[PDB]
Amino acid sequence: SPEFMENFQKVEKIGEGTYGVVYKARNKLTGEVVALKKIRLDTETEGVPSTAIREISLLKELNHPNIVKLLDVIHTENKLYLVFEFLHQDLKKFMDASALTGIPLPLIKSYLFQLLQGLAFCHSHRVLHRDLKPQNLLINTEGAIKLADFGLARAFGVPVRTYTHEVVTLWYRAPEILLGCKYYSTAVDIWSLGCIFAEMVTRRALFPGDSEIDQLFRIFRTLGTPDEVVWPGVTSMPDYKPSFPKWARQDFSKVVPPLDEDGRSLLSQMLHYDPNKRISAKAALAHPFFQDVTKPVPHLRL
Ligand SMILES: O=S(=O)(O)c1cccc2cccc(Nc3ccccc3)c12
Ligand SMILES: O=S(=O)(O)c1cccc2cccc(Nc3ccccc3)c12
Ligand SMILES: COc1ccc(O)c(-c2nc(N)nc(N)n2)c1
């Protein structure tokens, strides 16, 4: 039986991702609470590009405990309403609420482990997230964390307006993208998650840049300016300039003080400059940092 928007009662705005406001709503017929996303389509040109349609189809095929569940898609007047399972809060809000104490290590480990499981699944199905950040990660009272707000629209020219509040995506952007690589790989998601891992541990974003070049320099100042030894081919990348300053790599004892050899070993592999050497999500799941991983239940108030 088709669902119609009249079937839903808005309860409250719970967020605003790359597609604007996200509303918690109640299904009038079943009483099920859901999250609704409003997509405004603009046939600016001929329509959604074939490749974009295929990528949307690929994302839709994914069924995994660590990917927010899309329950239905309602079409009406030049608009689409995405009906998703309802999740209480995002990782960004949770970290801010835990900033003065910090998210406990067992939870950090559980969330990282789960995000790697979700990414491994996506990557094996040829799906990348492309815009991983704390704001697009959803957590439930059960202790699960899920991927949401995939960067598909801006990555494949989907004719749909994006954004609402602003932008801060640069902070988690992989260096090969900042250097203008012709083709990037699944490794870009691992870099972003590595930045998130460090952020949960230190309680502060790792590379909070304000422009592409500022983002690059913040990365270089911490991990060292890459050269051909560390990253073969870096000096020939489209936007690489020999004039870049030369910074030496900093010790992780300074970058992420709380972490030990296991956590630092894993983080170093997730932030490797060379995409071909950066650890994969599948390999990361086998890292010793996860030997004692559990599934703690977070404490959240509303
Ligand atoms: O494939 S759908 O499940 O609709 C879909 C689901 C989720 C997001 C979408 C974004 C743009 C276009 C779609 N398709 C579309 C296709 C025909 C007409 C209007 C929109 C999207
Ligand atoms: O909303 S997201 O959380 O990314 C999302 C999460 C989980 C499954 C999705 C399936 C299709 C489209 C999405 N978003 C989408 C919306 C508009 C344009 C292109 C893709 C999906
Ligand atoms: C598909 O995107 C979704 C799907 C379901 C959701 O519950 C959310 C969401 N939920 C909350 N509480 N905050 C925020 N920021 N987002 C987002």
Residues near 118 by Cβ (< 8 Å), separated by ≥ 6? 64, 65, 66, 67, 146, 147
Torsion sign, CA atoms 289, 292, 297, 299:
negative
| Cα Rg of the chain (Å, integer) | 20
Residue of 11, 13, 14, 70 with the most ligand 3 atoms within 8 Å of its CB, for mutation: 14
Residue of 60, 76, 80 with the most ligand 1 atoms within 8 Å of its CB, for mutation: 80
Binding-site annotation: residue ranges:
14-22, 37, 85-87, 90, 133-136, 149
DSSP string, 61-79: H---TTBPPEEEEEE-SSE
Give the pair of three-digit tokens for residue 23: 């509303």
- The number of CA neighbours under 13 Å toward the Cβ of 115 is 27
> Which of 94, 102, 92, 171 minimizes the C-alpha distance to 135?
92
d(CA 231, CA 141): 42
> Is 214 tagged catalytic?
no
- Residue 301 is given by DSSP the state -
Q: Which of 42, 72, 131, 260 is catalytic?
A: 131
Q: Locate CATH 3.30.200.20 in the chain.
A: 5-88
Fold annotation for 89-299: Transferase(Phosphotransferase); domain 1 (1.10.510)
Q: Which residues share a beta bridge with 146?
A: 138
Q: Which residues share a beta bridge with 69?
A: none
Torsion of CA 36, 37, 41, 47, to 10 degrees: -100
Contact between 86 and 69 under an 8 Å Cβ cutoff? The reply is no
Q: Locate CATH 1.10.510.10 in the chain.
A: 89-299
Q: Which amino acid is at 148?
A: A
d(CA 18, CA 26): 23
Q: Where are the alpha helices (DSSP H) in the chain?
A: 50-61, 91-97, 105-124, 152-155, 175-178, 187-202, 212-223, 252-255, 261-270, 281-284
Q: Burial level of 9, CB count in 10 A (0-12/13-18/19+)?
A: exposed
Nearest CA to ligand 1 atom 16: 53
| Residue located via tokens 């599934």 | 295
Q: What number does CATH give the domain 5-88?
A: 3.30.200.20
Is the Cβ atom of 74 under 6 angstroms away from ligand 1? no
Degrees to nearest 5, angle at CA 113 with 172 and 69: 80
d(CA 151, CA 231): 26
Query: How far is CA 256 from each of CA 230, 239, 250, rounded to the nearest angstrom?
Result: 21, 29, 11
Is the Cβ atom of 116 under 6 angstroms away from ligand 3? no
Query: How far is CA 111 from each of CA 30, 179, 217, 280, 297, rounded to the nearest angstrom?
Result: 31, 30, 29, 17, 11
Contact between 270 and 284 under an 8 Å Cβ cutoff? The reply is yes
Binding-site annotation: residue ranges for ATP:
14-22, 37, 85-87, 90, 133-136, 149
Residues near 263 by Cβ (< 8 Å), separated by ≥ 6? 201, 256, 289
d(CA 252, CA 133): 21
d(CA 274, CA 228): 10
Torsion of CA 39, 42, 43, 44, to 10 degrees: -150
Q: Burial level of 284, CB count in 10 A (0-12/13-18/19+)?
A: buried
